[PDB]
Amino acid sequence: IVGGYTCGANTVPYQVSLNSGYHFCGGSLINSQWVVSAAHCYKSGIQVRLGEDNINVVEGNEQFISASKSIVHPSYNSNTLNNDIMLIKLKSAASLNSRVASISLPTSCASAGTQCLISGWGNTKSSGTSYPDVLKCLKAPILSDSSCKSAYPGQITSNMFCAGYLEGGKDSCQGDSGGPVVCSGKLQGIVSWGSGCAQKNKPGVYTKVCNYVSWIKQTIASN
Ligand SMILES: [Br-]
Ligand SMILES: [Br-]
Ligand SMILES: [Br-]
Ligand SMILES: [Br-]
Ligand SMILES: [Br-]
Ligand SMILES: [Br-]
Ligand SMILES: [Br-]
Ligand SMILES: [Br-]
Ligand SMILES: [Br-]
Ligand SMILES: [Br-]
Ligand SMILES: [Br-]
Ligand SMILES: [Br-]
Ligand SMILES: [Br-]
Ligand SMILES: [Br-]
Ligand SMILES: [Br-]
Ligand SMILES: [Br-]
Ligand SMILES: [Br-]
Ligand SMILES: [Br-]
Ligand SMILES: [Br-]
Ligand SMILES: [Br-]
Ligand SMILES: [Br-]
Ligand SMILES: [Br-]
Ligand SMILES: [Br-]
Ligand SMILES: [Br-]
Ligand SMILES: [Br-]
Ligand SMILES: [Ca+2]
Ligand code: NA
Ligand code: NA
Ligand code: NA
Ligand code: NA
Ligand code: NA
Ligand code: NA
């Protein structure tokens, strides 16, 4: 997250860190058994880390649970990043509490102009590199589909939206991938892609979760 703020420990209780020896992506806890992330975050060997603030220090509220199954969307295209969503089932259920909690799925899509909260452990610099140890947060608006297309001609599908600031300076970044965009208490987006981070006229691009609710629910029901 570039241009954001320190969230505070456990103030984003649905935020997960995906670990394969090191943090590599975010995710969102949607019930005790299941996490939603980006398909481009797929790997074998995922350990889901819940209750994290400092990802490098045990602080006492963590739950470390191996993934049993990873389900990449059937129509995921890694060249176009269309359908950039994956479900991860936990080998055992999380213990839900005030610091480890699920985020509701949307019953309709959110509109342009809606403020959302985007969070993660990704890079905090637009030119440089610098990876934080504690969770970072950014409040940002959903952009118009027309502004999004104009920013990334030929690239924005019906399963994508933009959020952030056309001026630059405030965006998600590398290492935030797979994490949440929450608006009015519902998971509306997954950190998916962009051109660099926090560049002018290059806002973040997010998977449009509302298009996937039926697939999420049916897949959880059957797995
Ligand atoms: Br801060
Ligand atoms: Br739940
Ligand atoms: Br401790
Ligand atoms: Br486990
Ligand atoms: Br299973
Ligand atoms: Br397909
Ligand atoms: Br590819
Ligand atoms: Br292709
Ligand atoms: Br269990
Ligand atoms: Br507990
Ligand atoms: Br607690
Ligand atoms: Br639901
Ligand atoms: Br909703
Ligand atoms: Br809708
Ligand atoms: Br917000
Ligand atoms: Br910062
Ligand atoms: Br940093
Ligand atoms: Br729009
Ligand atoms: Br276009
Ligand atoms: Br909220
Ligand atoms: Br919330
Ligand atoms: Br959505
Ligand atoms: Br720039
Ligand atoms: Br679908
Ligand atoms: Br749906
Ligand atoms: Ca920790
Ligand atoms: Na990929
Ligand atoms: Na644990
Ligand atoms: Na495609
Ligand atoms: Na806003
Ligand atoms: Na830090
Ligand atoms: Na399309």
The CATH number that applies at residue 4 is 2.40.10.10
Q: Are residues 175 and 190 in the same domain?
A: yes
Q: Are residues 1 and 33 in the same domain?
A: no
Give me the resolution in angstroms, 1 decimal: 1.3
How far apart are alpha carbons 51 and 13 in whole angstroms?
7
Question: How many domains does the chain divide into?
Answer: 2
Q: Active-site residue numbers?
A: 40, 84, 177
Q: Are residues 142 and 188 in the same domain?
A: yes
How far apart are alpha carbons 205 and 8 in whole angstroms?
25
**Residue 82, annotated ligand binder?**
no
- C-alpha 41 – ligand 27 centre gap (Å): 7
Q: Are residues 196 and 216 in the same domain?
A: no
Q: Are residues 114 and 64 in the same domain?
A: no
Chain center to CA of 119:
7
- Give residue 46's domain range: 13-102+211-222
How far apart are alpha carbons 191 and 203 in whole angstroms?
11
Nearest ligand to residue 192 Cα:
27
Nearest ligand to residue 5 Cα:
1
How far apart are alpha carbons 206 and 105 in whole angstroms?
15
Q: Are residues 121 and 184 in the same domain?
A: yes
- C-alpha 78 – ligand 8 centre gap (Å): 7
| Three-state DSSP string of 134-191 | CCEEEEEEECCHHHHHHHCCCCCCCCEEEECCCCCCCECCCCCCCCEEEECCEEEEEE
- C-alpha 68 – ligand 5 centre gap (Å): 5
- Asked whether the beta carbons of 185 and 104 are under 8 A apart, the reply is yes
Three-class DSSP category at 77: strand
**Residue 56, annotated ligand binder?**
no
Q: Are residues 194 and 117 in the same domain?
A: yes
Q: Are residues 112 and 196 in the same domain?
A: yes
Q: Are residues 149 and 66 in the same domain?
A: no
How far apart are alpha carbons 80 and 181 in whole angstroms?
20
CA–CA distances in Å: residue 190 to residues 51, 57, 91, 129: 19, 26, 23, 22
